[PDB]
Amino acid sequence: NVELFKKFSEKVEEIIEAGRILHSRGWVPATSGNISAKVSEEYIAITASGKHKGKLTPEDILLIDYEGRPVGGGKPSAETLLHTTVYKLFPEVNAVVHTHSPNATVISIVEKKDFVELEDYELLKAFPDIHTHEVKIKIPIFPNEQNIPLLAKEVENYFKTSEDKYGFLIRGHGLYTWGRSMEEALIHTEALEFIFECELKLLSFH
Amino acid sequence: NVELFKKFSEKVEEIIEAGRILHSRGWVPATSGNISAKVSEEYIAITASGKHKGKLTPEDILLIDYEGRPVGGGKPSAETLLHTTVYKLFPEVNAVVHTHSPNATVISIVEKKDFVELEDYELLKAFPDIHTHEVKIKIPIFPNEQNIPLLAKEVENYFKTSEDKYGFLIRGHGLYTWGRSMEEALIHTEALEFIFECELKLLSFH
Amino acid sequence: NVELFKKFSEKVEEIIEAGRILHSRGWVPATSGNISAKVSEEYIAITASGKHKGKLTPEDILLIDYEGRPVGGGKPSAETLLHTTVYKLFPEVNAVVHTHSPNATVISIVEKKDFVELEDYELLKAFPDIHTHEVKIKIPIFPNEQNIPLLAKEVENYFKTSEDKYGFLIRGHGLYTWGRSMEEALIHTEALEFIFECELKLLSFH
Amino acid sequence: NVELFKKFSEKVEEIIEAGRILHSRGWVPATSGNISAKVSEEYIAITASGKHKGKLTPEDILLIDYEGRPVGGGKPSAETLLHTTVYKLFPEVNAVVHTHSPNATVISIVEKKDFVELEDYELLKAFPDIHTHEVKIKIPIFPNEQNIPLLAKEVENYFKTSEDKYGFLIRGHGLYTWGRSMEEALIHTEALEFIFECELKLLSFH
Ligand SMILES: [Cl-]
Ligand SMILES: [Cl-]
Ligand SMILES: [Cl-]
Ligand SMILES: [Cl-]
């Protein structure tokens, strides 16, 4: 079976910790959000969807394949499909974080354009990874597509053709980001959650 | 006397902890709110109304009957009647939480409709209990009925005939939720408090 | 010299703790606010005005008389006069807390009427002391009177003739409350700070 | 080499702590902001720009000269130039703090005038250092000048000719303050961040 058990357990502890941190920020209320971490080139560790991310225990962490399918046999879910999609788009990514903050939810409902943009040299330093011809951090907003494979399709199309790879928003579902490490993903989450705060606060005088 | 003393003491510790958690969220300011836990099919443990939920001690926890009456003889109160009402409506419920957050209070005053609604698949996972023909989490708002038995009446009528059983709001009094366990009730409280946040924030641009 | 030293030291520790609690709430930013505690019928312990209430040490606590004068000889200050005023109005009061929250400051500037009112049975339980013919918690707002003795005069007149004795606001200076114990004062502060939150939030849609 | 190593290490620990405090306030999200401390009349310790101020370790602290140049040879940066500028303007200053809060960022975008003002006797006590003919705490706003030496020029001109020396804002970059000690700088930061809160909240009803 190899040393998967070793890496899996490490990701379990990594995810439980990430969950306590997210919760302390008010970004994963009452079961919303989800967290995943790369176990190996064949398996991913992902938080069970109905569990509160702020009180995880080993039993709440599931092991799936790059097809979003649960190793112990099963059918993929929207969340499981969406994470694997991220892993496939960015081979360097080892962690995916989905938050569901009040600001993200609200922005998902009032933003008329299909993206949120800000331009913050200050915040760019959080994405030393991304090289682009712009200085504006951009966050694409995807529709609440009930058709999962199509939603995935649009996300792939966007990121395959876009220089910016900060994260994305799915209206009525929440924010998604990722990183080469859980630390990098959390940092990205914070950066984006910050933008959502400014974006709205602006639209409280506009 | 049986092992009531055993269960009572466990609920005391459960309630004091729930109170510290609620307070840390700013949901039980200066004595507002109240917490109750099922001791047995004949008794309920409830927080004394004039005590700060964030600094409870065993002496602040009262023992009442399913009639809202204080075991040591006494006359029921509005709060005591309202909780027992919840216990009677839902036999599976073992804990009731009443919060009084700034958002809930405000919503109690500005919402024109008699309910708050949102629709959040994400948040629905917090109510694995409820099965309905809708995807919108709904929260009924009841009037500041001075006539307690009538208020109770309306709450009973609503929930006896409604598929949704998330919680309810009493204008000028606060939010009410419940769960099969204190943990489940707290999680529900968070989910609903989240909706109140988005609801208002929306109405800051509408 | 008696056992003043005993009581003084107890109030020192009481005040330092009250200060850490206030600061954690964001109610005493950068030196604003002040805290006082009754040492005896002849002396009061009060926090030095230029010290940050969230990092007090014994050296930051001053001992004054019921005349606001610093025992070691000196001339009274506005703050010292205002607290002694409170102590004189309410003989049962042993602690006075002055906070300076963003909400209080803002309310001090936008409220057109000379008082803030709310009516919250829920919050009334925080003032088991006050008996009145009303159900609305009321907070009088006094002008930024440069003439200290006149400001004091108006405060005395108000409370000598008013049934409500929750606390008061001095525009451009901050909120004031008190209690038979520091715990009671802090609880009152929270109750009033809560009202300031709702009051404004309302005026974000009105 | 002298005892620089002694002082440097002390500033390292001072800066890491300041960073944890700033982060807990939500003022240095995802790498934004920066912190510096005077090591000697020839060297300054400054936080690396791309590191998260809330998770600093000795390796993230750089040593530069009063010319903003990195001792180990290198070319100055905007941040490094801006801090040294502050150190040169105020010889008593031993610490510089740059925050990047949601409020500061937002204010940087909506404030039409080139400064923010408030007038708060209460807050003035936080600046026992500054003597002026006014009672209003003033914060000058400088443009997002890509031309660094010119930005520096304007900042110097302002403070060389202004009685107020509370701090300043660079649109799209963040708030800057300083103090004779890190504690004094943090206190100033809080005072200014408070004003930004009130300023906006006002402009939510104006
Ligand atoms: Cl807003
Ligand atoms: Cl709002
Ligand atoms: Cl507001
Ligand atoms: Cl606002």
Q: What structural class do helix, strand and pairing data of chain A support?
A: alpha+beta
Radius of gyration of chain A: 16 Å
Order of helices and strands of chain A: HEEEHEHEHEHEEH
Topology-level CATH name of chain A: L-fuculose-1-phosphate Aldolase
The number of helical segments of chain A is 6
Residue share in β-strands of chain A:
15-25%
Strand order of the largest sheet of chain A: 3-2-1-4-8-7-6-5
Number of domains of chain A: 1
> What is the quaternary state of this protein?
homotetramer
Biggest interface and residues each: A-B, 21 and 19 residues
CATH H-level name of chain A... which superfamily?
A: Class II aldolase/adducin N-terminal domain
Counted beta strands of chain A: 8
> Class of chain A, according to the CATH hierarchy?
Alpha Beta
Summarize the amount of helix of chain A as a percent range.
25-40%
- State the end-to-end CA separation of chain A: 59 Å
Bound molecules: chloride ion
Shape of chain A: globular
Describe this structure in words.
Four copies of one chain form a homotetramer. Helix content of chain A is 39%, strand content 18%. By secondary structure, chain A is an alpha+beta fold. Chain A has a single domain, classed as Class II aldolase/adducin N-terminal domain (L-fuculose-1-phosphate Aldolase), CATH 3.40.225. In chain A, strand 7 (168-170) and strand 8 form a beta hairpin. The structure holds chloride ion (4 copies).
